[PDB]
Amino acid sequence: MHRIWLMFDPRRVMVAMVGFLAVLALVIHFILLSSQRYSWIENGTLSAAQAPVGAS
Amino acid sequence: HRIWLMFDPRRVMVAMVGFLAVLALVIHFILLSSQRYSWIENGTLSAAQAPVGASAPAAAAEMSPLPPG
Amino acid sequence: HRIWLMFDPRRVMVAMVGFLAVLALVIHFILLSSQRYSWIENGTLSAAQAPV
Amino acid sequence: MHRIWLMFDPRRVMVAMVGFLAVLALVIHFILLSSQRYSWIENGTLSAAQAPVGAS
Amino acid sequence: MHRIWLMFDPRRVMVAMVGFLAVLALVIHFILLSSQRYSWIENGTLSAAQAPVGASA
Amino acid sequence: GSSYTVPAPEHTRRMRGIMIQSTLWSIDGKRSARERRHYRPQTTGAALGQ
Amino acid sequence: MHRIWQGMDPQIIMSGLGFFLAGLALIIHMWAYSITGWPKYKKAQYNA
Amino acid sequence: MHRIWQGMDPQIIMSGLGFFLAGLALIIHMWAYSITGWPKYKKAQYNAQ
Amino acid sequence: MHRIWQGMDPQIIMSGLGFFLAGLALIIHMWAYSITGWPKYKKAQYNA
Amino acid sequence: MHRIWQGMDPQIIMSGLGFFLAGLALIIHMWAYSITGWPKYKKAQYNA
Amino acid sequence: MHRIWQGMDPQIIMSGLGFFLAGLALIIHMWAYSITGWPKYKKAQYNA
Amino acid sequence: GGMTEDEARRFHGYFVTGTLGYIIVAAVAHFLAWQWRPWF
Amino acid sequence: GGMTEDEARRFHGYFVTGTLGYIIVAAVAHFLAWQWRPWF
Amino acid sequence: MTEDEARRFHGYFVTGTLGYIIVAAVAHFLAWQWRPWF
Amino acid sequence: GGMTEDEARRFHGYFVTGTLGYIIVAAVAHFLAWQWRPWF
Amino acid sequence: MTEDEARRFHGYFVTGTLGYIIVAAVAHFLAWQWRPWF
Amino acid sequence: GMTEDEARRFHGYFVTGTLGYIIVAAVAHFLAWQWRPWF
Amino acid sequence: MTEDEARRFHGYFVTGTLGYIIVAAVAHFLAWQWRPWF
Amino acid sequence: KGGMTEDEARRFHGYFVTGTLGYIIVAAVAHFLAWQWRPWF
Amino acid sequence: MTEDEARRFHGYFVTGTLGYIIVAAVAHFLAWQWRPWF
Amino acid sequence: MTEDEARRFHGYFVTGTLGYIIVAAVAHFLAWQWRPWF
Ligand code: BCL
Ligand code: BCL
Ligand SMILES: COC(C)(C)C/C=C/C(C)=C/C=C/C(C=O)=C/C=C/C(C)=C/C=C/C=C(C)/C=C/C=C(\C)CC/C=C(C)/C=C/C=C(\C)C(=O)O
Numbered sequence: 001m002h003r004i005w006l007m008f009d010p011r012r013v014m015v016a017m018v019g020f021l022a023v024l025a026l027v028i029h030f031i032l033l034s035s036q037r038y039s040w041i042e043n044g045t046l047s048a049a050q051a052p053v054g055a056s
Numbered sequence: 057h058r059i060w061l062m063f064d065p066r067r068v069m070v071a072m073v074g075f076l077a078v079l080a081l082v083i084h085f086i087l088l089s090s091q092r093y094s095w096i097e098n099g100t101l102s103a104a105q106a107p108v109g110a111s112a113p114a115a116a117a118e119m120s121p122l123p124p125g
Numbered sequence: 126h127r128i129w130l131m132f133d134p135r136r137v138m139v140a141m142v143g144f145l146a147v148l149a150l151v152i153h154f155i156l157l158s159s160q161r162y163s164w165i166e167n168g169t170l171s172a173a174q175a176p177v
Numbered sequence: 178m179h180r181i182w183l184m185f186d187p188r189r190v191m192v193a194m195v196g197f198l199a200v201l202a203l204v205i206h207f208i209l210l211s212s213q214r215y216s217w218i219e220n221g222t223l224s225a226a227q228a229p230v231g232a233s
Numbered sequence: 234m235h236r237i238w239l240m241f242d243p244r245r246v247m248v249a250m251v252g253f254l255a256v257l258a259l260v261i262h263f264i265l266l267s268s269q270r271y272s273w274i275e276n277g278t279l280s281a282a283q284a285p286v287g288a289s290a
Numbered sequence: 291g292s293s294y295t296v297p298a299p300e301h302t303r304r305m306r307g308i309m310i311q312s313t314l315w316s317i318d319g320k321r322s323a324r325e326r327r328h329y330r331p332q333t334t335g336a337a338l339g340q
Numbered sequence: 341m342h343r344i345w346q347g348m349d350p351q352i353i354m355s356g357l358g359f360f361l362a363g364l365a366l367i368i369h370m371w372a373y374s375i376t377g378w379p380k381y382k383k384a385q386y387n388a
Numbered sequence: 389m390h391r392i393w394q395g396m397d398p399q400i401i402m403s404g405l406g407f408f409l410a411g412l413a414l415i416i417h418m419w420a421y422s423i424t425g426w427p428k429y430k431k432a433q434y435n436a437q
Numbered sequence: 438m439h440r441i442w443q444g445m446d447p448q449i450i451m452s453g454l455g456f457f458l459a460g461l462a463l464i465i466h467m468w469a470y471s472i473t474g475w476p477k478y479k480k481a482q483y484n485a
Numbered sequence: 486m487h488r489i490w491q492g493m494d495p496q497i498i499m500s501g502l503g504f505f506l507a508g509l510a511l512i513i514h515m516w517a518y519s520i521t522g523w524p525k526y527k528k529a530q531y532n533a
Numbered sequence: 534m535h536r537i538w539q540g541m542d543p544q545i546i547m548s549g550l551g552f553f554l555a556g557l558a559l560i561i562h563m564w565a566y567s568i569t570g571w572p573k574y575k576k577a578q579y580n581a
Numbered sequence: 582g583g584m585t586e587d588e589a590r591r592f593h594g595y596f597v598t599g600t601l602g603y604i605i606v607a608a609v610a611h612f613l614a615w616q617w618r619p620w621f
Numbered sequence: 622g623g624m625t626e627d628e629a630r631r632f633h634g635y636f637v638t639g640t641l642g643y644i645i646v647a648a649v650a651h652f653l654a655w656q657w658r659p660w661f
Numbered sequence: 662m663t664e665d666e667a668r669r670f671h672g673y674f675v676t677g678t679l680g681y682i683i684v685a686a687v688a689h690f691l692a693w694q695w696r697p698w699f
Numbered sequence: 700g701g702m703t704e705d706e707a708r709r710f711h712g713y714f715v716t717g718t719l720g721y722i723i724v725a726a727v728a729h730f731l732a733w734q735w736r737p738w739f
Numbered sequence: 740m741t742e743d744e745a746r747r748f749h750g751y752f753v754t755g756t757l758g759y760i761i762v763a764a765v766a767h768f769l770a771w772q773w774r775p776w777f
Numbered sequence: 778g779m780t781e782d783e784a785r786r787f788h789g790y791f792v793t794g795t796l797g798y799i800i801v802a803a804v805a806h807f808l809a810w811q812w813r814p815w816f
Numbered sequence: 817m818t819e820d821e822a823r824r825f826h827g828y829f830v831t832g833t834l835g836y837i838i839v840a841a842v843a844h845f846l847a848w849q850w851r852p853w854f
Numbered sequence: 855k856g857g858m859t860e861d862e863a864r865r866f867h868g869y870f871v872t873g874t875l876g877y878i879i880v881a882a883v884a885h886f887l888a889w890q891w892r893p894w895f
Numbered sequence: 896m897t898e899d900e901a902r903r904f905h906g907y908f909v910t911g912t913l914g915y916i917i918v919a920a921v922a923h924f925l926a927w928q929w930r931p932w933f
Numbered sequence: 934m935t936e937d938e939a940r941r942f943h944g945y946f947v948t949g950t951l952g953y954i955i956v957a958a959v960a961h962f963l964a965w966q967w968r969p970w971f
C-alpha cells in the first residue's frame with residue numbers, strides 16, 4: 001500500500017490534494033452562504049425551528 | 057492484470073479520478089437544482105411532503121426586477 | 126482476432142470508451158430534459174400517470 | 178471485387194465509413210425525434226391512428 | 234475510352250466522386266425535407282391528392 | 291405580481307433568450323422552425339384511456 | 341456463348357445476380373401486395 | 389457444382405447464412421403476427437380474465 | 438460436421454452462445470409475460 | 486468436459502461467476518419483493 | 534479446495550471481506566429498521 | 582484461400598443435407614400453421 | 622489457430638450432447654407452461 | 662498487402678456489411694409495424 | 700497458462716460439488732417460498 | 740503484436756463487449772417494467 | 778503470494794471464522810424472530 | 817512495469833474499487849430510505 | 855491466367871443455364887397459382 | 896497504370912456507375928408513384 | 934525513494950488523513966446540533 005508512493009511523487013500528491021480540499025471547502029461554504037436556510041452570517045442566531053425551510 | 061501493461065496506471069489513475077470528480081459534481085449539482093432533491097433547503101421534509109412531478113419548464117417567473125438581496 | 130493487427134487495441138479502446146461515455150451522457154440528458162422521463166421529479170409516478 | 182483494398186487502405190476506409198455512418202445515424206435519429214409524428218419519447222406509446230400527421 | 238485514367242488518378246477521382254455524390258444527395262434530401270409538399274417525415278402518409286400544392290396565380 | 295400561475299406547456303417558450311422575438315423570429319418565417327418555438331401539449335396515459 | 345464469362349469471377353456474377361433478384365423481388369412483392377390487397381383483407385378478417 | 393465453394397471460408401459462409409436466416413425469420417414472424425393476429429387475441433383472453 | 442469447429446477458439450464460441458441464449462431468453466421471457474399476463478395477476482392478488 | 490477450463494485463470498472464473506450470481510440475485514430479489522409484496526405488508530402491520 | 538487461495542495474499546482478501554461484510558451489515562440493518570418498526574416505536578415512547 | 586476440392590465436395594454434401602432438413606422442418610411448420618389459421 | 626481436428630471433434634461431441642440436454646429441459650418447461658396457461 | 666490478405670479481409674468485410682444491413686432491415690420492419698411513414 | 704490436467708480435473712470436481720450444493724439449497728429456498736406465498 | 744497476442748486480446752474484448760451488452764439489456768428490461776416507452 | 782501449505786492453513790482458519798460468524802448470526806436471527814417475526 | 821508489478825497493482829486496485837463502489841451502495845440505500853426516487 | 859478457364863467456364867455455363875431455367879419454371883408455377891387465386895387483368 | 900489493368904478498372908467503374916443510375920431510376924420511379932412532382 | 938522511506942511517509946499520511954476525517958466529523962456533529970439538514 002505504501003508502494004503507491006513509489007508510483008506517485010508525495011510532493012505533487014500533497015500539493016494537488018491541498019488545492020482540491022481548499023477549493024472544495026470554499027465551494028461548500030459559499031453554497032451554504034448563498035442559501036436561505038444556512039446563510040449563517042445574517043440568520044445564524046435563529047433557532048432550528050425558526051430557520052427557513054423549502055416549500056413543501 | 058494485463059490491462060496495466062497496455063495502459064500505464066499513472067495516467068489512467070488521473071483520468072479516472074477526473075472522470076469520477078466531474079460525474080459526482082454533475083450529479084450533486086443536478087440534485088441541488090431539482091425541486092424534489094434540493095436537500096440544502098428542503099432536506100428536513102419527510103418523503104410525503106417532498107415535491108413530486110414538478111418538471112414545469114416555466115416553474116418560475118422569467119421576468120422580474122432584482123430582489124433587495 | 127487479426128483485426129487487432131490492423132488496428133491498435135489501445136487507440137480503439139480509448140475511442141470506444143470516449144464515444145460510449147458521450148453517448149450515455151447524451152441519452153441520459155435527453156431523457157432528463159423530457160416530460161415523460163424526467164425521473165428526478167417524475168420517478169415516483171406510476172406509468173399511467175406519467176406524461177404523454 | 179477485393180482489389181479495391183489494394184487501391185484504398187482498409188484502415189482509413191473503415192475509419193471514414195464508421196465516422197460517416199455514425200454521423201448519419203445520429204442525424205436521422207434526431208430528425209425523427211424533433212418531428213411531431215416520431216418523437217417516440219413523449220408520444221411513443223401512442224398508436225399509429227393517434228400519432229400526428231402533417232396538414233393536408 | 235479507358236485512357237482517361239492515364240490523365241487522372243482513379244484513387245483521387247473515386248474519392249472526389251463519392252464526396253460530391255454524398256453532398257448532393259444530402260442537399261437534395263434536405264431541400265425536400267424543408268419543403269411543404271415533400272416533408273415526408275410528417276405528411277408522408279398523405280395521398281397524392283391530399284399533399285400540399287403551392288400557391289397558384 | 292403578488293402570485294404566479296404556471297402556464298400551460300403550449301404557452302411556454304423553449305428558447306430562453308430575451309431578445310429572440312425581435313432578432314430572429316421577426317425575420318424568421320419557416321413553418322417547422324415556428325412550430326419548434328413552444329413546448330407541446332401533454333396529457334397522461336390514464337386520461338387517454340390507455 | 342460461354343466466352344462472355346471469361347475473365348470474370350463466378351462469385352461476383354452470383355453476388356450481383358443475387359442482389360438483382362433480391363431487390364427486384366422486394367419491389368415486385370410490394371407492388372403485388374398493393375394490387376391484390378391480400379394481407380389487408382385476410383388481416384381484416386382475422387382482426388375483426 | 390461444389391466448385392462455387394472452392395476458395396471461400398466455411399465459417400464466413402455459415403455466419404452470413406445465419407445472419408440472413410435470423411433476420412428473415414424475425415421479419416416473417418412479425419409479418420405472421422400481423423396477419424394471423426395470434427398474440428393479440430390470446431393476450432385479450434388472458435387479460436380479460 | 439465437426440470440421441466447422443476447426444481453427445476457432447472454444448471460449449469465444451461459448452461466449453457467443455451464452456450471449457445468444459441470454460438475449461433470446463430475456464426477449465422471450467418479456468414476450469411470455471406480455472402474453473400470459475403473469476406476474477401481473479398474481480401481483481394484483483397479493484397487493485390488493 | 487474439463488478441458489474447457491484449460492488456459493483459464495480460476496480466480497477470474499470465480500470472480501465472473503460471483504458477479505453473475507450477485508447481479509442475478511439482486512434482480513430476482515427485487516422481482517420477488519414486487520410479486521409477493523412481503524416487506525410492504527409486514528411494514529404495514531408493524532408501522533401502524 | 535484450499536488451492537483457490539494460492540498466489541493471493543491474505544491481507545487483501547481480508548480487507549475485501551471486511552468491506553463486503555460492513556456494507557452488507559449496514560444495508561441489512563437499515564432494511565430491518567424499516568421492516569420491524571424499531572427504534573421508531575421506542576423513540577416515540579421516550580420522546581412523548 | 583481455403584476449401585480445396587475434396588473439402589468443397591464434403592461441405593457441399595453437408596450443406597445440401599442441412600438445407601433439405603431445414604426445408605422439411607419448415608414445411609411441417611407451415612402445414613401445422615395452415616390448419617391452425619389459413620392465410621388465404 | 623486453436624482447436625485442431627481431434628479436439629474439434631471432441632468439442633463437437635460435447636456441444637451436441639449439451640444442446641440435446643438444453644432442448645429436452647426446455648421441452649419439459651414448455652409442457653408445464655402449456656398445462657398452466659396454453660397459448661393459441 | 663498481398664492479394665491473399667486482401668481476399669481474406671474482403672470476406673470478413675462483406676459478412677459484416679451483410680449483418681449490418683440485415684439488422685437494419687429488421688429494425689425498419691419493426692418501425693413500420695409500429696408507425697408507418699407512407 | 701494455468702490449471703493443468705490434474706488441477707483442471709480436481710477443479711472440475713469441486714466446481715460440480717459446489718454447483719450441486721448451491722442448486723440444492725436454492726431448491727429448498729424455493730420450496731419454502733412456495734409454501735409461504737405461491738406465485739402461480 | 741503477434742497473432743497469439745491478438746487472439747488473447749480478442750478473447751477478453753469479445754467477452755467484455757458481450758457482457759456489457761447483456762447488462763445493458765437487463766437495464767432496459769428494468770426500465771421497461773418501470774415505464775414503457777412504446 | 779501464497780504457497781500450498783500457507784493456503785491450506787489460511788483456508789482452515791477461514792472456514793473456522795466463517796462457521797463462527799454463521800453461528801453468531803443464527804443466534805441473533807433466532808432472538809430477533811422471537812422478538813418480532815418478519816413473516 | 818513488469819508482470820508481477822501489474823499483478824500487485826491489480827490486487828490493490830480491485831480491492832479499493834470494490835470498497836469505494838459499494839460504500840456508494842450504502843450511500844444509495846440511505847438516500848432511498850430518506851427519499852425514494854421510484 | 856485468371857478465373858473460370860474454358861473447361862470450367864463451359865461447365866459453369868451449363869449449371870448457370872440449368873439454374874436460370876429451374877428458377878423460370880418455379881416462378882411460372884407461382885404466377886399460375888397466383889392467377890387462379892386473384893387474376894390481375 | 897497498364898492498359899490491361901486499366902481495362903479491368905474501366906469495366907468495373909462503368910458497371911458501378913451504370914448500376915448506380917439504374918438504382919436511382921428505380922428510386923425515382925417509386926417516388927413518382929407515391930407523390931408526383933409534375 | 935526507497936521502500937522504507939515510502940513506509941514512513943505512508944504511516945504519517947494515513948494518520949494525518951484519518952485525523953482530518955475525525956475532526957471534520959466532529960465539526961459536522963456540532964453543525965447538526967446547531968441546525969440539522971435532514
Ligand atoms: C411467463 C413465462 C414463465 C416461464 C416460462 C419458461 C419457459 C417456457 C422456459 C423458460 C426457461 C427458463 N426460465 Mg423462465 N418462466 C417464468 C419465469 C422465470 C423466472 C422468474 C423468477 O420469474 C426465472 C428465474 C426463470 C428462469 C428460467 C431459466 C432457468 C430458463 C432459461 C435459461 C436461460 O436463462 O438461458 C439464458 C442464460 C442466461 C445466463 C440468462 C442470463 C439473464 C440474466 C437476467 C442476466 C443478469 C446479468 C447481470 C448480472 C445483470 C445485472 C444488472 C444490474 C442492473 C447491474 N423463469 C414464467 C413463470 N421459462 C427456458 C428453459 O430452458 O426452461 C428449462 C424455457 O424453455
Ligand atoms: C421525398 C424524398 C424521399 C426519397 C427519395 C429518394 C430518391 C428519389 C432517391 C433517393 C436516394 C437515396 N435515399 Mg432518399 N428518400 C426518402 C427518404 C430517405 C431516408 C429516410 C430516413 O427517410 C433515407 C435514409 C434515405 C436514403 C437514401 C439513400 C439510400 C439513397 C442515396 C444514396 C447515396 O447518397 O449514395 C452516395 C454514394 C454511393 C456510392 C452509395 C450508393 C448506394 C446505392 C443504394 C447502391 C449502389 C449499387 C451499385 C451497383 C453497387 C453494387 C455492388 C454489387 C451488388 C456487389 N432516403 C424520401 C421518402 N431517395 C437516391 C438513390 O440513389 O436511390 C437509390 C435516389 O435517387
Ligand atoms: C414478408 O414480406 C416480404 C419480405 C416482402 C415477403 C417476401 C419474401 C421473400 C422474397 C423471401 C425469400 C426467401 C428466401 C429466398 O430468397 C429464402 C431462402 C432460404 C434459404 C436458401 C435457406 C437455406 C438454408 C440452409 C441451411 C439452414 C443449411 C445448413 C447447413 C448446415 C447446418 C450444415 C453445414 C455443414 C457444416 C458446417 C460442416 C460441413 C463440412 C465441412 C466444413 C468440412 O468437411 O470441412
Ligand SMILES: COC(C)(C)C/C=C/C(C)=C/C=C/C(C=O)=C/C=C/C(C)=C/C=C/C=C(C)/C=C/C=C(\C)CC/C=C(C)/C=C/C=C(\C)C(=O)O
Binds near residue numbers: 127255258669
Ligand atoms: C433525412 O434524410 C437524410 C438523412 C437527409 C437522407 C439520407 C441520405 C443519405 C446520403 C444516405 C446515405 C446512405 C448510404 C450510402 O451512401 C449508406 C451507406 C451504408 C453502408 C455502405 C453501410 C455499410 C456498413 C458496413 C459495415 C458496418 C461493415 C463492417 C465490417 C465488419 C464488421 C467486418 C470487419 C472485420 C474485420 C476487419 C476482421 C477481419 C480482418 C482481417 C482478415 C485482416 O485484418 O487481415
Ligand SMILES: COC(C)(C)C/C=C/C(C)=C/C=C/C(C=O)=C/C=C/C(C)=C/C=C/C=C(C)/C=C/C=C(\C)CC/C=C(C)/C=C/C=C(\C)C(=O)O
Binds near residue numbers: 462513709
Ligand atoms: C425477472 O425477469 C427475468 C429476468 C426475465 C427472469 C429471469 C430469467 C432468466 C433467463 C434467468 C436465468 C437464470 C440462469 C440461467 O441459466 C441461472 C443460472 C445459474 C447458474 C449457472 C448457477 C451456478 C452456480 C454455481 C456455483 C455457485 C458453483 C460454485 C462452485 C464453487 C464455489 C467451487 C469452487 C472450486 C474450487 C475452490 C476449486 C479450486 C481449485 C483450484 C483453483 C485448483 O485446483 O488449482
Ligand SMILES: COC(C)(C)C/C=C/C(C)=C/C=C/C(C=O)=C/C=C/C(C)=C/C=C/C=C(C)/C=C/C=C(\C)CC/C=C(C)/C=C/C=C(\C)C(=O)O
Binds near residue numbers: 155207744
Ligand atoms: C435519443 O436517442 C438518440 C441518441 C437520438 C439515438 C441514438 C442513436 C445512435 C446512433 C446510437 C448508437 C449506438 C451505438 C453505435 O454504433 C452503439 C454501439 C455500441 C458498442 C459498439 C458497444 C461496445 C462496447 C464494448 C465494450 C464495453 C468492451 C469492453 C471490453 C473489455 C472489458 C475488455 C478489456 C480488455 C482487456 C482486459 C485486455 C487485457 C489485456 C490483454 C489481454 C493483453 O494486454 O494482452
Ligand SMILES: COC(C)(C)C/C=C/C(C)=C/C=C/C(C=O)=C/C=C/C(C)=C/C=C/C=C(C)/C=C/C=C(\C)CC/C=C(C)/C=C/C=C(\C)C(=O)O
Binds near residue numbers: 510514
Ligand atoms: C435487503 O434486500 C436485498 C439486499 C436485495 C436482500 C438480498 C440479500 C442478499 C442476496 C444477500 C447475500 C448474502 C450473502 C451471500 O451471498 C452473504 C455472504 C456472507 C459470507 C460469505 C460471509 C463470510 C464471512 C466470513 C468470515 C467473517 C471469516 C472470517 C475469518 C477470520 C476472522 C479468520 C482470519 C484469520 C486468518 C485467516 C488467519 C491468517 C493466517 C495466515 C495469514 C497464515 O497462517 O498464513
Ligand SMILES: COC(C)(C)C/C=C/C(C)=C/C=C/C(C=O)=C/C=C/C(C)=C/C=C/C=C(C)/C=C/C=C(\C)CC/C=C(C)/C=C/C=C(\C)C(=O)O
Binds near residue numbers: 007079154821837
Ligand atoms: C444525472 O444523471 C447523469 C449524470 C446525467 C447520468 C450519467 C450517467 C453516467 C454516464 C454514469 C457513468 C458511470 C460510470 C461509468 O461510466 C461509473 C464508473 C465507475 C467506476 C468504474 C468507478 C471506479 C472507482 C475505482 C476506485 C475509486 C479505485 C480505487 C483504487 C484504490 C484506492 C487503490 C489504489 C492504490 C494502489 C493500487 C496502491 C498499490 C500500488 C502498488 C502495489 C504499486 O504501485 O506497485
Ligand SMILES: COC(C)(C)C/C=C/C(C)=C/C=C/C(C=O)=C/C=C/C(C)=C/C=C/C=C(C)/C=C/C=C(\C)CC/C=C(C)/C=C/C=C(\C)C(=O)O
Binds near residue numbers: 367391863871
Ligand atoms: C413491377 O416492376 C415494375 C417496374 C413496376 C414493372 C417493370 C418490371 C420490369 C422491367 C422487370 C424486369 C425483369 C427482368 C429483366 O429482364 C428479369 C430478369 C430475370 C432474370 C434473367 C433472372 C435470372 C435468374 C437466374 C438464376 C436464378 C440463376 C441461378 C443459377 C444457379 C443457381 C447456378 C449457379 C451455380 C453454378 C454455376 C455452379 C458453379 C460452377 C462453377 C464455378 C464451375 O463449374 O467452375
Ligand SMILES: COC(C)(C)C/C=C/C(C)=C/C=C/C(C=O)=C/C=C/C(C)=C/C=C/C=C(C)/C=C/C=C(\C)CC/C=C(C)/C=C/C=C(\C)C(=O)O
Binds near residue numbers: 903910
Ligand atoms: C435542387 O436541385 C439541385 C440539386 C440544385 C439541382 C442539381 C444540380 C446538379 C449540379 C446536378 C448534378 C448531377 C450530376 C452530374 O453533374 C450527377 C452525377 C452522377 C454520377 C456521375 C454518378 C456516378 C456514380 C458512379 C459510381 C457510384 C461508381 C462506382 C464504381 C465502383 C463501385 C467500381 C469500383 C471498383 C473498383 C475500383 C475495383 C477495381 C480495382 C482495381 C482495378 C485495383 O485497385 O487494382
Ligand SMILES: COC(C)(C)C/C=C/C(C)=C/C=C/C(C=O)=C/C=C/C(C)=C/C=C/C=C(C)/C=C/C=C(\C)CC/C=C(C)/C=C/C=C(\C)C(=O)O
Binds near residue numbers: 027
Ligand atoms: C453541494 O455540494 C457539492 C460540492 C456539490 C457536493 C459534492 C461533494 C463532493 C463530490 C465531495 C467530494 C469529496 C471528496 C472526494 O472524494 C473528499 C475527499 C477527501 C480526502 C481524501 C481528504 C484527505 C485528506 C488528507 C489529509 C489532510 C492528509 C494529511 C496528511 C498529513 C498532514 C501528513 C503529511 C506530513 C508528513 C508526511 C510529514 C512527515 C514527513 C516525512 C515522513 C518525510 O518527508 O520523509
Ligand SMILES: COC(C)(C)C/C=C/C(C)=C/C=C/C(C=O)=C/C=C/C(C)=C/C=C/C=C(C)/C=C/C=C(\C)CC\C=C(C)/C=C/C=C(/C)C(=O)O
Binds near residue numbers: 468488638
Ligand atoms: C418476439 O417473438 C419472436 C422473437 C419474433 C419469436 C422468436 C422467433 C425465432 C425465430 C426464435 C428463434 C429461436 C432459435 C433459433 O433457431 C433458437 C435456437 C436455440 C438454440 C440453437 C439453442 C442451442 C443451445 C445449445 C446449448 C445450450 C449447448 C451447450 C453446449 C455445452 C454445454 C457443451 C460444451 C461444454 C463444454 C465443457 C465445452 C468443452 C470444450 C472443449 C474444448 C473440450 O472438451 O475439448
Ligand SMILES: CCCCCCCCCCCCO[C@@H]1O[C@H](CO)[C@@H](O[C@H]2O[C@H](CO)[C@@H](O)[C@H](O)[C@H]2O)[C@H](O)[C@H]1O
Binds near residue numbers: 727729734736816
Ligand atoms: C435461504 C433463502 C431464503 C429462503 C426463504 C425464502 C422464503 C421465505 C419463507 C417464508 C416462510 C415463513 O412462513 C410463514 O411463517 C409465518 C409466520 O408468521 C406463518 O404465518 C402464520 O402466523 C402469522 C402470525 O402469527 C399469521 O399472521 C399468519 O396468518 C399465519 O399463517 C405463515 O403461514 C408461513 O407461511
